């Protein structure tokens, strides 16, 4: 496929890489917990100039 | 402003030779190089990673 022949002639030929694939997914974040105050933002029924 | 070398005004004349009566054996050094690294490149490794 490297060399788009199907005769190869004699030698060493540079074809692709070896890489070991990653085997699970870890996700870390932090433990605290809180709910977010968007509430205070969005539904205030007034706002500034 | 540099220096070109030493002044030195050779005898000339038209009957008149320099015979060397000595010699020295000088060894001399020369560097040549030969080789370079040898490089290799993943392009698509280098450019995109995984
Ligand atoms: C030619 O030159 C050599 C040196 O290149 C002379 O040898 C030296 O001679 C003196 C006096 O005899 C010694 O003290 C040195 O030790 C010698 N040096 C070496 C390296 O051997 C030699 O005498 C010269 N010959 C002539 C005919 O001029
Ligand atoms: C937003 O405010 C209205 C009154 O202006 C209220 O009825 C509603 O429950 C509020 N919503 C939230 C998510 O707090």
Redesign the pocket.
Not at chain 2, 21 to 24: G, I, L, Q, V, Y
């Given at each position: 496929c490297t060399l788009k022949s199907f005769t190869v002639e004699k030698g060493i030929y540079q074809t692709s890489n070896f890489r070991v694939q990653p085997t699970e997914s870890i996700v870390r974040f932090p433990n605290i917990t809180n709910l977010c105050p968007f509430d205070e933002v969005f539904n205030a029924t007034r706002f500034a100039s | 402003t540099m220096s070109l070398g030493a002044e030195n005004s050779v005898a000339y004349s038209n009957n008149s030779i320099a015979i060397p009566?000595?010699?020295?054996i000088s060894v001399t050094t020369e560097i040549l190089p030969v080789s370079m690294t040898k490089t290799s490149v993943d392009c698509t490794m280098y450019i995109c990673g995984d």
């Open positions: - | 009566t000595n010699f020295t």
